[model samples]
Target: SAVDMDECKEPDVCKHGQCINTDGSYRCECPFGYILAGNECVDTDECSVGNPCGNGTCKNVIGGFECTCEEGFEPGPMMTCE
Candidate 1:
């Protein structure tokens, strides 16, 4: 179907991401720690301002983050130390 022939015909349309064809348009689907920004895949640091590492050392990772637990504390969700 000619209508099915969409504009998603480029190999580099979505860098580091995937092009998802929709009913009338196409969308970019990036990884869990990435986002579709200006046809590019940029890392979304979830620890910059979030609850990650709650007062702990939030180290930004490739696809996520890690934190150092305090004394008598443990690593919890959002890479936070609890």
Candidate 2:
């Protein structure tokens, strides 16, 4: 009998991401702030690129980034401060 294995039960299995169990196998789904990198989920530093916040400060988060708008400016869509 071929017993379906629950690979996700392993504690270290897909530790950095969500483990989706399948027939005799499993998959890792990284969160929004992370990306799958060689059997592991790593944080993507969005701030490493250009400034996302227009006239504001950019902060790197776990899987994404944040923006602190300057005075007289409010947080806008796409991490831009308007």
Candidate 3:
């Protein structure tokens, strides 16, 4: 028996991520801030790094990350103290 390989047959099996082809198998490449689990990618908490925004809060969201100013502050002109 003979089998055909179509590399481009499957496009973007993992949404908003990358694809890696292995020997008789394929895997998805999650971004830097994501961890791969099953067939989906999960967000990695940037807050674990001692608050990415310094004076703000780091929030991990679906397929992405976000930062919000602390309670008494807001988005400044250049992402700094007002």
Candidate 4:
């Protein structure tokens, strides 16, 4: 029902959001509702939202959402699509 605070710890002590120095100098940072776990954003359990993905399975992800068709449906919505 809550965030796995430990998810962004130790091995996953990465940055939630990042910035490129372009000139070649940077640092890590943490902000509200953000957690970087192995360059793979794995936060915000979309499943928490009641049926956001209509007729599909809700898969939680950082800054995004996914699903598997359910009830009556075909392929699910792609992240890069539309």
Candidate 5:
């Protein structure tokens, strides 16, 4: 009689993401702005690719980012200021 363990029962098993329970173990499903790193989730540096926020300032935040537009500018797709 073998009893299967439920790893998802543990508190905070998947920090910053969802815990997917499977046989003998579990997996983490990180959010869109985060990536799996050594059994944990870390914020993705979206600004590293380039100046995502054109004509605006890019600020990296947990699970996402914020864009501050310049004078007479409005926010656009992908946080670009237009």
Candidate 6:
């Protein structure tokens, strides 16, 4: 007998990350700057990744990402919300 299984076919079931299929199971593949923790995805400290945001601060938010402009900077076309 043969059967088919649809894994990770549902919408928004894997959070804002990638979906990995395994034998009789599936897992969510977190994107860069993120790490998988249990059934949830946590942000990876960009500061540990060489601090891409020069002169700015890096914040790791749950299930997402963010960056804040440093002092002497305002929210303009160059900078935005953290």
lDDT of 2 by residue, 1-82 (tens): 8767767555556558887888768988887778776566667887776667865677676656777777676764445555
Question: Candidate 3 at residue 9, lDDT?
Answer: 34
* Reference-based lDDT, residue 36, model 3: 59
Quote model 1's TM-score.
0.53
Which lDDT tens digits does candidate 3 get at residues 1-82? 8654423235435544566656576667787767755555557665555545667766654444456767776543222333
lDDT computed for candidate 6: 0.55
Which residues of candidate 4, in runs, are more than 4 Å off? 1-14, 19-42, 75-82
Off by over 4 Å in 1: 1-11, 21-25, 71-78
Global lDDT for candidate 1? 0.65
lDDT of 1 by residue, 1-82 (tens): 3667343445555656767777877777787887876777767876676547666567666577767755567775444566
Of 1 and 4, the candidate ranking higher by lDDT = 1
In terms of TM-score, how similar is model 2 to the real structure? 0.58
Estimate, for each residue in 1-82, the C-alpha lDDT of model 6 and write its tens digit. 8644435544534555687767787778787657765555557654454333565665554434345667665433222343
Which ranges in model 3 have alpha carbons more than 4 Å from their true place?
1-16, 62-64, 71-82
- Estimated TM-score for each candidate: 0.53, 0.58, 0.51, 0.38, 0.62, 0.44
Rank candidates, TM-score, best first. Answer: 5, 2, 1, 3, 6, 4
Instruction: Give the backbone clash total of model 3.
Output: 0
- Give the lowest summed-lDDT range of ten residues in model 6: 73-82
Q: In model 6, where do residues sit more than 4 Å from their true spots?
A: 1-14, 48-51, 61-70, 73-82
lDDT for position 70 in model 3: 74
Question: Model 6 reaches what TM-score against the true structure?
Answer: 0.44
Q: Model 3 TM-score?
A: 0.51
lDDT of 5 by residue, 1-82 (tens): 8667656455546555666779879888887888876556678877665556665677666555656777676655455555
Ranking by lDDT: 2, 5, 1, 3, 6, 4
**Winner by TM-score:** 5
